[PDB]
C-alpha cells in the first residue's frame, strides 16, 4: 500500500500549509539535473517523490524512502521570503514526523539535504529537500468467495496407464 500513503502525505501537507504553498504534486523520479528546466515549478511549492524502499524487518513490510523537495524563488540572490521558506521546511518536518499516513507508520526523518547547486541557483530556485523513511506493509493476499453445491467426487487410483482403470464416481447427495 504505497499510493494510499502518498495520497495521505499530500492531503496532510495541503491541510497543514493550505494557501501558503502554491501547489503540491507528486514528482516522477528523483530530482535530476534537468528537472528545473522541465517541471511546472510555480514556486513556492513542494513535491513529494518516492525514492524507492529498502528491506523492512519482515517479509511483509518495507522501509519506504520518500522525499519532500521544497521550491522557492531567489530573485537577485535573495530568497523571496527566507522566514517563509524556513518555516515551511520546519513545519513540513514537524507535521510529517512520527505521525502515520495511511498504512505507513513511524515516519522518521532521515536527512534534510540543501540540494541547491548551480543548476538551481542560476534558475532562481532553492531546493531544500527533506527525506523520510517509513515502515509500510505489503498488501495481503486477495481473498476468494464461491459456493458450489457439492454433488460429485471423482477419484481415480493411479495405476499404470494401460493397466485397466480403477475409479470411483461417488456422486454424493444421491438417495436410494
Amino acid at each position: 500500500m504505497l499510493e494510499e500513503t502518498e495520497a495521505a502525505l499530500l492531503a496532510r501537507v495541503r491541510e497543514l500549509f493550505g494557501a501558503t504553498l502554491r501547489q503540491v504534486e507528486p514528482l516522477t523520479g528523483t530530482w535530476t539535473n534537468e528537472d528545473v528546466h522541465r517541471l511546472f515549478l510555480a514556486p513556492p511549492s513542494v513535491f513529494l517523490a518516492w525514492m524507492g524502499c529498502g528491506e523492512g524487518r519482515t517479509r511483509r513490510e518495507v522501509e519506504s524512502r520518500w522525499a519532500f523537495f521544497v521550491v522557492a524563488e531567489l530573485l537577485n540572490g535573495e530568497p523571496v521570503n527566507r522566514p517563509g521558506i524556513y518555516q515551511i521546511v520546519e513545519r513540513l518536518i514537524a507535521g510529517v514526523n512520527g505521525q502515520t499516513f495511511g498504512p505507513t507508520t513511524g515516519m522518521r526523518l532521515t536527512q534534510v539535504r540543501n540540494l541547491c547547486d548551480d543548476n538551481r541557483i542560476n534558475a532562481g530556485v532553492v531546493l531544500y529537500g527533506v527525506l523520510f523513511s517509513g515502515t509500510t506493509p505489503l498488501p495481503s493476499v486477495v481473498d476468494l468467495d464461491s459456493l458450489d453445491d457439492y454433488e460429485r467426487h471423482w477419484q481415480t487410483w493411479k495405476f499404470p496407464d494401460e493397466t485397466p482403470e480403477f475409479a470411483a464416481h461417488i456422486n454424493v447427495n444421491q438417495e436410494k
Binding site: 454424493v172 444421491q174 438417495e175 436410494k176
Partner: protein
C-alpha cells in the same frame, strides 16, 4: 439377524429368555452404504437423554 436389523435373544439354561442384543433397524445411510451411527438402541437412548 443382527446384521439384518432384527434383534436376537438367548435362552438361558432352565428356559429363561435373555436379550442378546436389541438394535434398531438402521442399516444404511441416505446413500446405499452401511451406517453404524444409529445401530444400537443404546445410542438412541443416550442421545435422547
Amino acid at each position: 439377524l443382527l446384521f439384518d436389523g432384527i434383534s436376537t435373544f438367548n435362552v438361558n439354561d432352565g428356559g429363561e429368555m435373555q436379550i442378546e442384543r436389541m438394535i434398531t433397524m438402521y442399516r444404511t445411510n441416505k446413500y446405499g452404504d452401511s451406517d453404524p451411527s444409529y445401530l444400537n438402541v443404546n445410542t438412541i437412548a443416550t442421545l435422547s437423554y
